[PDB]
Design a protein around this ligand. Structure first.
Ligand SMILES: CCCCCCCCCCC(CCCCCCCCCC)(CO[C@H]1O[C@@H](CO)[C@H](O[C@@H]2O[C@@H](CO)[C@H](O)[C@@H](O)[C@@H]2O)[C@@H](O)[C@@H]1O)CO[C@H]1O[C@@H](CO)[C@H](O[C@@H]2O[C@@H](CO)[C@H](O)[C@@H](O)[C@@H]2O)[C@@H](O)[C@H]1O
Ligand SMILES: CCCCCCCCCCCCCCCCCC(=O)OC[C@H](COP(=O)([O-])OCC[N+](C)(C)C)OC(=O)CCCCCCCCCCCCCCCCC
Ligand SMILES: CCCCCCCCCCCCCCCCCC(=O)OC[C@H](COP(=O)([O-])OCC[N+](C)(C)C)OC(=O)CCCCCCCCCCCCCCCCC
Ligand SMILES: CCCCCCCCCCCCCCCCCC(=O)OC[C@H](COP(=O)(O)OCCN)OC(=O)CCCCCCCCCCCCCCCCC
Ligand SMILES: CCCCCCCCCCCCCCCCCC(=O)OC[C@H](COP(=O)(O)OCCN)OC(=O)CCCCCCCCCCCCCCCCC
Ligand SMILES: CCCCCCCCCCCCCCCCCC(=O)OC[C@H](COP(=O)(O)OCCN)OC(=O)CCCCCCCCCCCCCCCCC
Ligand SMILES: CCCCCCCCCCCCCCCCCC(=O)OC[C@H](COP(=O)(O)OCCN)OC(=O)CCCCCCCCCCCCCCCCC
Ligand SMILES: CCCCCCCCCCCCCCCCCC(=O)OC[C@H](COP(=O)(O)OCCN)OC(=O)CCCCCCCCCCCCCCCCC
Ligand SMILES: *P(=O)(O)OCC(C)(C)[C@H](O)C(=O)NCCC(=O)NCCSC(=O)CCCCCCCCCCCCC
Lengths: 494, 85, 75, 38, 81, 39, 98, 77, 170, 61, 74, 255
């Protein structure tokens, strides 16, 4: 039983215990929440054990278990540098997501925990599978649990939201499936170790690129294909929102490393000016739009759109710096956007019952712990240094500028507007007068739970912001394998 | 701790002592009215309120200025405003 | 109002009405001269302009280790 | 307060004396009458 | 006067007019914690400072007393004749 | 106004022996005035 | 109407006249002229002219508006306005769980 | 006598001031280092350096006047 | 000494701001002023050590960002210019901490105000002591954030809110 | 072009001067008294001029 | 004059103590706990990054030229 | 910092049009300004003289159109420098009391009868902590400039041979600054400084109405506001830059 298969098995045992413990003890709801939390903790503990044993400079997939009982659809698991940190981010985030809803579900708690635990197994399976069809099977398997999570525990407009996220993702994924099936037909197999060895013809690469890019653009999302995010990420329960923004957005980013950079390098090189136009447009249009967004979670949801454009531009830079920056920005956005949704969807929305920004003012006066963390998360969302958000933005933007300067400059302008919308929101909530006259009751400050799910998130971004080498050390050799090009005097040694 | 009635009356009384349009300094008292006791025109009362506002370093809104038709009313307005210096 | 009891807010009817109008605004969009031009400016022209500049200047320069007597122009 | 007047005059006494001292020495150089070496 | 303020708000910076009765004691403990880190940093900076030029013996260079690079040089340079 | 009324240079540019070519980085860098064109 | 406006508009004339003139001694004689013109038109009683006369002087008031009029620090527009506003509700939050 | 590169470079003379009259500045900069750059201690050395620079400047102004007439009183800047 | 000039204002800002409840108003003023003064004195020595005797001092602690060609380290470098600018920065900061003992005597947020003043000094010192452009830009963004927090110090005032956004965004 | 209100900028320009008679003269007379007279206010404009001049002359012997 | 420090941490009134919801056990000892243990093991982890392997080879290859000095020549 | 004493002195107020007197109420506070003001306007043999009155000379030292033109520009800016220097000094200390009588009410003059212990507020100065930096900064504004002018200017100073700052030999203009510059232009900023002070000092408390005549003309009113509204580089910023983005965000969200 490989460590990687252990990762997928623990959350399934937790589901079993959650749904059977009543036959051994009316069981208290606190029991279910404790089973689910410990389950995610042991999954985090296993992912940390794997990371200690992980080797930073191996071109072999590590911790793979030999199957040799070949079938039509077999599940092979393996990990290298590009997948190791996405696996860690999934295992760190999900316990925080569980605590972020400890008190705010209050109904169908068994269903919420089983759905949350199942989502962990599926999302981890996405980052661990060593086959392109296996990748697709898990990328899509999460829609029905996502569809039912929003509908069971979402806000007032959760019906329109759940439909939007289901149908957008399916429609785009159906175009990715067509591209994937063409690959398996030509090659005979979708296993990574032998599909990357193959060489597709240019026009095949061109049509393979559109099919895959249409799906990755719905999931980034790119601007104009992002209606589903505006609805789903806001109407979802807080735990759903954290998982949706901090893990699910990353699948398309990790999928660019496994599905287009190795097999479609000519198409990627010849179409970067189209990816960059869409990437540049998304940086500006989203930034201007979130400046005028009045729902606090939708403002924070809309920020994810702007940052996802920056690491989408990085992965197509064909440079070592852009690709490392893209993973580091995708990781950084995972912590910071998780904290900002806890601040908005968890702290403000539980106190007031509303998310309109018009009703908030001067919260610093009564809530100095919320404002202290909120400001640090508003700095991190603005790409301020000593946050992992700056190291990722600077490396991602440097690659974008070097690959194509006109897009780099425009994507650079995000340094202004991210700051602009992040600080403007911060002032209309924490500063900007005395406590809002709409509040009749006074508000309490962060509970111990709220303090420690924020302190944990702001610790990860800051420590990684001062020493990003912890992550870059395990990306240097694997990131190198996805670069496409040669130097005049280093190529073809004899 | 702030401004007391005794201090406000002295500043106000010494302010009107320098005004020629006032009939005499001896008619000034607590319940004095600018209109009939000190005999001031509508324009003179506007001058008096501006002098009071400059002396106490406060800005009086037009609606409040209309309310101040008496020396006692002025003393009460100064006491009501915390900002008065 | 929600599942978990919150604090008592002075839920202003005017602000509530404003936040509902925004959430429902998509249902009332219509194609007119104005709405067609704006939607054509943002979606087609400005993106196609950037795509033109990105396409035209892809590979035009390299800054790496450039010296005096050697240009930045690459094409 | 009396020490404030002492400091105000004292600072104004050290000043207006530094100017006169420097004018006595560096005045010819600044005005161009005598070059600095002479 | 002092502006009224809510008594129920806890801020780590202390709040509105916070001064604990034991402020002198706590100000001494924190000073000691502040002192020890600086000593830890000073020991580091003495060890890892790099200089390609050595000060002349007569000049006022108080770092020669506590840095390792100069002390090793001066110790070796004392061997003459 | 200043363009029509501003003083001409009242000193010949200074000349450094050898042009300081070696001290400024050899012939591959910019050197100083050395028996060059009048200005 | 036509009484409150005349008195309030008169006060703004005194303020603006002093706004442009820093020195108070020059503002004193500057004020008797302002007061004098109000005396010259104290006998007008025709409504068709009373409202027309108020329009001219407000237009004239805007004609010579100071780029930044004076305001006391603790007044709207002042430097100390709302510098340390107190917390509005001093009453402790009601017992809830979050 | 004139100071050559072999010791002028060793003396760390500023590059813009490695001129013909830089041999008087090597002792001046040494005096400046010893006296902590106080502007009342190396007066004799400081004035000595201002002599050679001024004389060369006086030599240069004459050359500039000769150049100006050569072009019939034109503009050289 | 060279690295003590770095961390001392930082420590003074951390204790005053994150433990203003523990040391109180006077405890905070004692630490920020003492840490800045001790830091100020050491700079005066550094001016003699570096500027006057011409010893540039190189101090490299650990790598910050390492990707292929980019090796940006938390490295500091003392030369003539950085000790020239450290003199007014420390001297006026010492005089401003001391000056604020009286100006803010009636302010109800003394600990926070003094915490900010020592963080800005730390960010100024980082800006000029860095030996690369990227680490310098940290102090560049550092003083900018400290400038934003000190403009908006009276955050209940709407006009000072607009000022801090102007300071931040411009 | 005279206005309905008899406001003339030339005499408005002319009137700017210390009036011969003023109803507020007595109230606003303390701003030009001995404490704030023309001589007293400019008496201490340069604080240490007198001391420095005396000291400099002593040094110039 | 100064006020005594006040305020309720975690909203706990001075009369009572913070009540536990049950997340504190696993979070402080399982989540953070394992995160310090992992940090300790990371100090003892062998260094397998490509860079340090490459600097060692880059060193020798530079020592074959005059840029660097061989500690053990020949 | 000395200015901060002035705001702390009266009412936490900082408007010029209500400042006056205070020459005797704040003696030390006035004194530090004068040292600072003359250091700022580069009065001869002061700290600012050795720096400010060397940049201008350096500009003429480079004999070119750009160097000469900026001289004229800087000198005009240097001319206008002393006027607000005069305005700060005069309107707060050397002018007639323009504030309320509360600022200027000493216990020596008997005004009140019963509330004599309080209700005076005679615009007192600050404590030790407020004046110790004031005194210390005063010396730096007199002697620090002269003491360090050899480190930073000298003639051939080697204070930056560690390459910290770098000057290319072809770009050196310092030699011409000391010798080639004509004496008239070297002392020209001082002539304007010591002259234009007297016009500003005569335009107030001596004439005091030439300026208001200019103010109430149509030419002066337009100039006064333009300079008071900071060249209008914030009205076009707020409307044609800031609100353009806000409307762009509006159009994208709504359309
Ligand atoms: C955004 C949709 C992208 C979906 C990805 C499809 C997966 C790849 C199929 C693209 C396709 C047709 C595309 C027709 C128009 C595309 C949709 C039109 C607009 C959609 C609303 C390329 O079709 C062209 O492929 C060229 C070869 O590459 C041939 O030359 C052409 O003759 C051929 O027509 C099929 O060709 C492909 O089939 C495979 C046999 O498994 C063959 O090996 C290749 O032949 C391969 O290329
Ligand atoms: C982020 C929380 C982590 C746990 C919290 C507790 C630690 C928080 C950091 C506190 C300061 C720790 C650094 C102190 C430095 C003092 C010197 C030192 O101890 O160095 C020893 C070691 C370094 O030793 P070394 O550099 O000398 O050599 C050994 C390391 N190799 C060989 C690999 C190079 O520092 C550490 O181990 C600190 C680890 C901190 C956290 C490491 C990564 C945490 C995040 C993992 C997930 C990342 C992806 C997420 C998605
Ligand atoms: C980059 C992200 C941040 C990384 C660094 C994280 C902190 C590291 C140490 C920073 C120095 C210590 C700061 C303490 C500030 C005072 C404590 C406090 O928060 O009080 C809350 C105070 C409460 O203080 P109080 O005592 O006055 O509270 C009671 C009175 N009321 C409630 C009315 C205010 O709340 C506020 O008023 C301000 C709200 C925002 C708080 C922001 C504080 C600064 C946070 C760190 C800034 C880091 C800058 C990084 C720059 C990056 C450079 C590239
Ligand atoms: C793994 C082995 C067990 C690890 C859990 C050990 C920590 C623990 O003791 O948890 C106890 C947990 C709740 O504690 P309990 O006292 O039973 O509840 C009282 C509420 N009134 O009691 C429980 O019910 C927790 C059950 C956890 C089951 C193991 C984790 C599920 C995933 C397995 C893979
Ligand atoms: C690695 C490969 C894995 C392949 C799949 C292996 C199995 C994965 C899980 C599939 C479904 C397992 C369901 C586990 C729960 C079953 C036990 C149960 O009865 O739970 C009941 C629970 C609460 O209901 P109850 O407590 O009875 O009523 C109380 C009312 N007060 O009610 C619930 O829990 C219902 C929860 C909501 C429905 C689940 C989330 C949506 C699932 C959509 C199903 C279709 C897609 C299936 C996808 C499988 C994973 C990809
Ligand atoms: C307050 C701000 C003060 C000004 C800030 C800028 C400082 C630099 C400005 C110019 C200062 C010029 C130097 C002043 C003193 C000059 C001097 O000659 O002092 C002598 C002293 C002795 O040093 P030493 O090298 O050993 O002498 C050997 C000679 N046989 O040389 C010295 O080093 C003694 C001075 C040491 C001062 C240390 C102060 C620690 C605090
Ligand atoms: C904050 C100060 C951190 C301590 C500074 C010195 C740490 C140390 O001793 O080195 C540990 C390690 C080695 O440094 P390295 O980056 O590998 O390269 C240095 C070249 N000799 O480098 C490290 O691992 C330092 C890790 C620091 C992690 C961030 C700590 C944030 C604390 C808040
Ligand atoms: C100097 C060159 C000025 C050219 C003459 C400009 C001029 O005189 O225009 C007239 C205008 C009068 O002001 P205005 O408000 O239009 O009066 C209306 C009364 N019916 O007055 C103006 O508009 C003059 C505007 C002056 C401010 C221009 C910016 C400063 C220029 C400094 C030189
Ligand atoms: P009091 O009992 O005296 O009040 C009697 C009133 C004034 C109410 C009379 O009954 C009266 O005249 N009716 C009010 C309406 C009216 O006709 N008002 C006439 C005077 S106000 C007016 O319109 C003329 C104002 C002239 C002076 C101001 C001109 C504007 C100056 C602007 C610039 C100043 C600074 C540059």
């Amino acid at each position: 039983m490989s460590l990687l298969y252990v990762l997928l098995i623990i959350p399934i045992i937790g589901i079993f215990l959650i749904s059977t413990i009543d036959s051994f003890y009316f069981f208290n709801v606190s029991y279910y929440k404790k089973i689910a939390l410990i389950t995610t903790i042991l999954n985090l503990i296993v992912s940390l054990i794997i990371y200690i044993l992980f080797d930073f400079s191996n071109n072999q997939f590590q911790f793979i278990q030999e199957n040799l009982d070949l079938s039509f659809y077999d599940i092979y698991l393996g990990v290298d540098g590009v997948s190791i940190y996405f696996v860690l981010l999934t295992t760190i985030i999900m316990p925080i997501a569980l605590v972020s809803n400890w008190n705010s579900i209050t109904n169908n708690i068994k269903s919420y925990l089983i759905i949350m635990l199942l989502l962990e197994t599926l999302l981890l399976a996405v980052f661990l599978v060593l086959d392109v069809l296996l990748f697709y099977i898990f990328f899509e398997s999460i829609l029905p649990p996502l569809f039912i999570l929003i509908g069971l525990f979402g806000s007032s407009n959760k019906v329109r939201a759940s439909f939007y996220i289901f149908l957008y993702t399916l429609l785009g994924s159906l175009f990715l499936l067509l591209s994937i099936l063409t690959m398996s037909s030509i090659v005979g197999t979708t296993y990574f170790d032998v599909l990357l060895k193959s060489s597709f013809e240019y026009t095949t690469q061109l049509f393979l690129f559109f099919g895959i890019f249409i799906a990755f653009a719905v999931k980034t999302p790119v601007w104009g294909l992002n209606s589903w995010l505006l609805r789903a990420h806001v109407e979802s329960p807080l735990g759903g929102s954290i998982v949706l923004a901090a893990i699910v957005l990353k699948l398309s980013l990790y999928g660019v490393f496994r599905l287009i950079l190795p097999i479609l390098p000519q198409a990627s090189l010849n179409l970067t000016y189209i990816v960059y136009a869409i990437g540049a447009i998304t940086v500006l249009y989203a930034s201007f739009s979130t400046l005028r967004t009045v729902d606090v979670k939708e403002l924070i949801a809309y920020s994810s759109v702007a940052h996802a454009a920056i690491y989408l531009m990085g992965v197509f830079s064909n440079t070592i710096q852009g690709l490392e920056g893209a993973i580091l920005l995708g990781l950084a956005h995972g912590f910071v956007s998780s904290g900002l949704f806890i601040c908005a969807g968890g702290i403000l929305y539980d106190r007031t019952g509303t998310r309109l920004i018009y009703f908030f003012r001067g919260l610093t006066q009564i809530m100095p712990l919320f404002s202290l963390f909120f400001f640090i998360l508003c700095l991190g969302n603005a790409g301020t240094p000593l946050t992992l958000n700056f190291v990722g933005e600077f490396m991602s933007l440097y690659g974008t500028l070097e690959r194509l300067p006109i897009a780099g400059m425009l994507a650079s302008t995000s340094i202004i507007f991210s700051a602009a919308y992040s600080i403007y929101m911060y002032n209309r909530i924490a500063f900007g007068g005395s406590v809002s006259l709409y509040f009749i009751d006074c508000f309490r400050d962060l509970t111990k739970r709220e303090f420690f799910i924020l302190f944990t998130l702001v610790s990860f971004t800051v420590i990684l912001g001062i020493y990003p080498s912890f992550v870059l050390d395990g990306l240097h050799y694997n990131i190198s394998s996805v670069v496409y090009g040669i130097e005049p005097n280093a190529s073809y040694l004899t | 701790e702030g401004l007391q009635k005794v201090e406000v009356y002295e500043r106000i009384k010494s302010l009107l002592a320098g005004f020629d349009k006032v009939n005499d300094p001896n008619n000034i008292t607590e319940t004095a009215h600018f209109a009939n006791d000190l005999g001031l025109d509508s324009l003179d009362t506007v001058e008096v309120v501006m002098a009071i506002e400059e002396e106490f370093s406060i800005e009086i809104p037009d609606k409040d200025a209309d309310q101040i038709h008496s020396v006692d009313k002025a003393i009460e307005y100064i006491l009501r405003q915390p900002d008065a210096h | 109002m929600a599942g978990l009891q919150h604090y008592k807010i002075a839920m202003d009817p005017a602000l509530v009405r404003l936040g509902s109008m925004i959430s429902n605004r998509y249902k009332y969009f219509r194609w007119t001269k104005r709405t067609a031009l704006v939607s054509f400016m943002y979606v087609v022209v400005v993106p196609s302009t950037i795509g033109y500049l990105a396409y035209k200047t892809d590979g035009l320069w390299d800054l790496r280790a450039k010296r005096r007597g050697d240009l930045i122009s690459e094409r | 307060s009396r020490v404030h007047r002492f400091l105000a005059t004292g600072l104004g006494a050290s000043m207006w004396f530094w100017i006169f001292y420097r004018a006595k020495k560096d005045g010819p150089v600044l005005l161009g009458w005598k070059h600095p070496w002479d | 006067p002092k502006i009224p303020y809510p008594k129920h708000v806890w801020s780590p910076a202390g709040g509105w007019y916070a001064q604990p009765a034991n402020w002198k004691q706590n100000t001494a403990i924190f000073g000691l914690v502040i002192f020890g880190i600086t000593a830890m940093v000073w020991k580091y900076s003495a060890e890892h400072e790099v200089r390609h030029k050595m000060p002349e013996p007569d000049r006022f260079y108080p770092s020669r007393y506590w840095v390792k690079q100069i002390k090793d040089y001066e110790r070796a340079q004392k061997e003459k004749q | 106004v200043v363009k029509l009324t501003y003083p001409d240079r009242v000193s010949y540019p200074r000349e450094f022996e050898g042009g300081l070519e070696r001290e400024l980085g050899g012939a591959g860098a910019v050197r100083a005035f050395l028996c060059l064109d009048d200005e | 109407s036509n009484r409150q406006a005349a008195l309030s508009l008169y006060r703004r004339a005194l303020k603006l006249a002093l706004d442009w003139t820093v020195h108070r001694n020059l503002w004193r004689g500057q004020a008797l002229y302002i007061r004098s013109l109000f005396e010259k038109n104290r006998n007008v009683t025709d409504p068709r002219l009373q409202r027309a006369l108020l329009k001219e002087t407000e237009k004239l008031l805007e004609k010579w508006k100071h780029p930044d009029p004076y305001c006391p620090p603790t007044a709207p527009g002042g430097s100390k306005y709302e510098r340390n506003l107190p917390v509005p509700n001093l009453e402790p939050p009601p017992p809830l769980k979050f | 006598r004139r100071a050559t590169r072999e010791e002028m470079r060793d003396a760390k003379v500023p590059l813009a001031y490695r001129d013909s009259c830089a041999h008087l500045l090597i002792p001046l900069n040494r005096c400046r280092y010893e006296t902590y750059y106080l502007p009342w201690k190396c007066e004799d050395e400081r004035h000595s350096y201002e002599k050679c620079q001024y004389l060369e400047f006086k030599k240069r102004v004459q050359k500039m006047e000769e150049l100006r007439e050569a072009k019939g009183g034109a503009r050289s800047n | 000494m060279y690295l003590s000039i770095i961390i001392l204002p930082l420590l003074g800002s951390v204790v005053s701001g994150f433990f203003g409840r523990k040391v109180g108003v006077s405890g905070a003023q004692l630490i920020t002023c003492s840490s800045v003064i001790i830091t100020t004195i050491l700079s005066i020595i550094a001016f003699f050590e570096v500027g006057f005797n011409n010893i540039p001092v190189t101090i490299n602690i650990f790598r910050w960002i390492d990707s292929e060609w980019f090796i940006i380290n938390w490295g500091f470098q003392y030369d003539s210019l950085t000790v020239s600018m450290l003199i007014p920065v420390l001297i006026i900061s010492s005089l401003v901490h001391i000056y604020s003992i009286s100006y803010m005597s009636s302010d109800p947020h003394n600990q926070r105000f003094f915490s900010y003043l020592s963080l800005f000094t730390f960010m100024m010192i980082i800006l000029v002591t860095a030996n690369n452009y990227l680490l310098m830009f940290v102090g560049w963004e550092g003083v900018g954030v400290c400038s934003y927090l000190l403009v908006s110090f009276w955050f209940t005032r709407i006009a000072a809110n607009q000022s801090s956004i102007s300071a931040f965004l411009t | 072009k005279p206005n309905i209100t008899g406001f003339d900028m030339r005499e408005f320009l002319r009137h700017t001067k210390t009036p011969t008679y003023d109803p507020w003269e007595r109230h606003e007379a303390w701003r030009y008294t001995g404490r704030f007279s023309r001589f007293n206010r400019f008496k201490g404009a340069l604080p240490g001029f007198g001391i420095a001049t005396v000291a400099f002359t002593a040094y110039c012997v | 004059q100064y006020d005594p420090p006040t305020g309720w941490l975690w909203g706990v009134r001075p009369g009572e103590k913070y009540q536990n919801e049950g997340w504190e056990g696993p979070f402080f000892y399982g989540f953070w706990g394992s995160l310090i243990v992992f940090a300790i093991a990371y100090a003892y982890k062998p260094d397998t990054s490509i860079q340090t392997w490459a600097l060692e080879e880059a060193r020798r290859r530079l020592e074959a030229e005059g840029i660097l000095e061989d500690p053990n020549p020949t | 910092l000395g200015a901060g004493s002035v705001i702390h002195a009266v009412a936490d107020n900082q408007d010029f049009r209500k400042f006056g007197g205070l020459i005797s109420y704040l003696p030390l506070t006035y004194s530090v300004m004068l040292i600072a003001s003359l250091s700022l306007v580069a009065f001869p043999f002061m700290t600012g003289f050795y720096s400010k009155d060397f940049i201008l000379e350096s500009a003429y030292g480079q004999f070119s159109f750009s160097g000469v033109a900026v001289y004229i520009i800087a000198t005009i800016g240097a001319i206008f420098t002393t006027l607000y220097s005069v305005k700060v000094l005069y309107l707060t200390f050397l002018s007639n009391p323009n504030g309320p009588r509360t600022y200027y009410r000493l216990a020596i003059d008997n005004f009140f009868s019963a509330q004599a212990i309080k209700s005076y507020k005679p615009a007192h100065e600050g404590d030790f902590f407020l004046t110790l930096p004031l005194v210390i900064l005063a010396l730096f504004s007199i002697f620090f400039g002269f003491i360090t002018k050899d480190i930073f200017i000298g003639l051939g100073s080697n204070f930056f041979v560690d390459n910290s700052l770098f000057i290319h030999p072809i770009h050196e203009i310092m030699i011409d600054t000391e010798f080639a510059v004509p004496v008239l232009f070297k002392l020209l900023p001082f002539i304007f400084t010591i002259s234009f002070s007297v016009i500003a000092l005569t335009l107030s408390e001596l004439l005091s109405e030439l300026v208001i005549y200019f103010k109430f003309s149509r030419f002066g009113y337009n100039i006064f506001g333009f300079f008071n509204q900071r060249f209008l580089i914030e009205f076009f910023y707020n409307k044609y830059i800031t609100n353009l983005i806000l409307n762009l965000g509006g159009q994208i969200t709504k359309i």
